[model samples]
Target: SGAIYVGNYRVVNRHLATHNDWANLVWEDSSRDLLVSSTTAQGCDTIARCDCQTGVYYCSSRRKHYPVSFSKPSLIFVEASEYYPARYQSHLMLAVGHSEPGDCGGILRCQHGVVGIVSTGGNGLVGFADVRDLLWLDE
Candidate 1:
């Protein structure tokens, strides 16, 4: 119907979630597969396997932004559902957001590791299946 993004990436393939673990494919874009994995290094590192680079309009620098913002690049911030401070409520890492639609199927990183990828999103949050969970979705 409409468009998923403003990039040239064509969704070549995907791996649907197993048992709806919220851990599954985002989209296999049409970028090369040179993107290295974080597990190869001692630090939290991640590179785009698809290099599906898109234009990020930094057109908001002139506008006053929200007080709380994401500190890292290639990732967004999120909180878990129906807040209960000490309940150990976790968040959807991605396999989905900027708190918006453009944030899905994106990558999440550590202070530097590949923490997550798009999962799904809603209710003021997004879903990102744990990278560890997707390791074998094979092994």
Candidate 2:
């Protein structure tokens, strides 16, 4: 019901821009109705929706707050190995933050599965908060 961030990477060049680029789907939304937009890009650069309950997401170019959905993005699974470190701990999820190469994005669970997606290369500069800790159920 709240803002949920998916995929994260620190090394820009190391991160993947598609779903298939991920290793394995660890989580997904309850319904395929999640939105993917760029706060920095000003438009929907990449849109994704997943059933967290099923750990599966579908990336589409479907227009939202705009028009046109081109780019047949690949389906990638969220790989734990792609996690980036911040404050010593690691984070999950990867994003193509900013426009620079190697500047990746990610999400981290602090205290609980209160995941937060990190923006690299100045994409998601401002951190977001999760309304519920979904990962708690996974543990």
Candidate 3:
């Protein structure tokens, strides 16, 4: 029914991974419609003409806060949504689940495959960083 965030805080540490992924999608819109592109004038049929694969996949995460690490079934939508605007218009995918504070960079998975990274969300909706499609700069 509402949003939640931690009041107190402690800086989280960062770690680098040798491997990375890149398979995210980037659409555009600002009028609140799930359809309609931001650039193309005739965007109503973009999904019909361009690229769009919609559906929900069984997803979950263990980003809770402990050695035990929590787990739960994540009803993650495989595409974007209007309810929760992309935190990053260029690299965010809409999903629904409980992603804890330290879970920002946590992995959202559907079995052995990687889906996306937990970005931000509220009111029962969360956004995953569909950023694998982004350019990977040399370390």
Candidate 4:
């Protein structure tokens, strides 16, 4: 199992015993909702959505439903060495998954150990960065 803290929300991925190299994304909440999203394979696209509260999910390509349960960890921590780049000063990298182009472009500043997003130019406002909207890679 692996987890990532995105702001106040926690996203977790756990591997299924019967499946090979496949995992399900889960959210840490009372509902324990499955974080459903779309993925592409072999030039084909598939979409899936889940409602954990009612134990319901739908997939366009695969109509079969599987039972899933997720365990939440007691604590999570982020290491500065892992998120910070040596070459860049006063900046932190965020790996948001599969975001739209230009949606995740911005400068994130960390001060006193708190991370926030800032504008590109001078006199721009700085505010809390939404972890869900962040880009998966730094370009």
Candidate 5:
């Protein structure tokens, strides 16, 4: 018995409301106790937290990717492990725009809990940003 694997990819020229079938998750650990975060090909809202552990193999959130015109380019965040899995584990919350009116943002739901977006002001304009909270396991 071993760990199941997944892969990563990208999508270009999306014109419909659907999930990008190209995106996949892959495991890089023997312990199989890790998590992952990614985007759906449809480019809908962000579901940043994706788990790649042995038993967990599905993702939550069906956020529809808004179609971006040439004038208004939506910012898409692309992040990965950058390497193989490590012994480290952490909790994360994704926030968009500051806590003010005219701001568009929401939280990402996962099997663990809600990792929502909060406003951390920068450059006089609020935007969706990443925040991390690490969890420690005692054995």
Candidate 6:
């Protein structure tokens, strides 16, 4: 048995120090609730709830919650059939707001640890060959 390829979206920008603030903003904004609803539906509960007006993310779970933010908040689209066999897999699509700042985004494919790029505000999918040398800022 080898490592299973569980496709995932990886946030690349580390320069932005206001990730917690951004996540808080999104968390509080009821309009964007649908954005993270699917993640919560998948059993990942919202341990910390922030205020809609003021931005903040605090952990209310048994364990402390860490706020992770992305420079370019994007939407990820993955096909269920792409995870099989581990080697042959398609890069996940990250849909971002055209007005957002910073580079597209970074994603890591499981098993082989391939790195990919999401165009800044564009729908361009760039895939890397390996993640051995690349540094992954966010999980």
Report the number of the highest-TM-score candidate. Answer: 3
lDDT top scorer: 3
lDDT of model 1, residue 102: 38
Clashes of each: 17, 20, 1, 2, 12, 0
- Each candidate structure's TM-score, on Cα atoms with residue i matched to residue i, is 0.30, 0.21, 0.33, 0.15, 0.18, 0.19
By TM-score, the better pick of 2 and 3 is 3
Scored by lDDT, model 3 comes in at 0.31
Report the candidate with higher TM-score, 5 versus 6: 6
Worst 10 residues of 2 by lDDT: 62-71
Write the residue-wise lDDT of candidate 1 on 1-139 in tens digits. 0111112211111232123212223433211111111121133233232212121211121222122122122234333433212222132232212344433334444332344444335654444433333332111
What lDDT is reached at residue 20 by model 5?
A: 28
Model 3 TM-score, 2 decimals: 0.33
List residue ranges in candidate 6 displaced over 4 A. 1-11, 15-106, 114-131, 134-139
| Model 1 CA deviation exceeding 4 Å by range | 1-98, 133-139
Steric clash pairs (candidate 6): none
lDDT of 1 at 128: 42
In candidate 4, which residue ranges exceed 4 Å CA deviation?
Answer: 1-43, 53-68, 71-77, 85-139
For model 6, how does the per-residue alpha-carbon lDDT over 1-139 read when each residue is reduced to its tens digit?
0111222322222223245434533222111111111122122111112111111121222122222222222333322322222222222222222222233232323322323322222342222112232232122
Residue range with the least summed lDDT across 10 consecutive positions in model 6:
29-38
Q: Which residue runs does candidate 2 get wrong by more than 4 Å?
A: 1-16, 19-103, 120-124, 128-139
| Candidate 4 global CA lDDT score | 0.22
The lDDT of each candidate is: 0.28, 0.26, 0.31, 0.22, 0.24, 0.24
lDDT order of candidates, top first:
3, 1, 2, 6, 5, 4
As a TM-score, model 2 comes out at: 0.21
TM-score-sorted candidate list, best first: 3, 1, 2, 6, 5, 4
What is the TM-score of candidate 4?
Answer: 0.15
Total backbone clashes of candidate 5, pairs 3 or more residues apart or in separate chains: 12
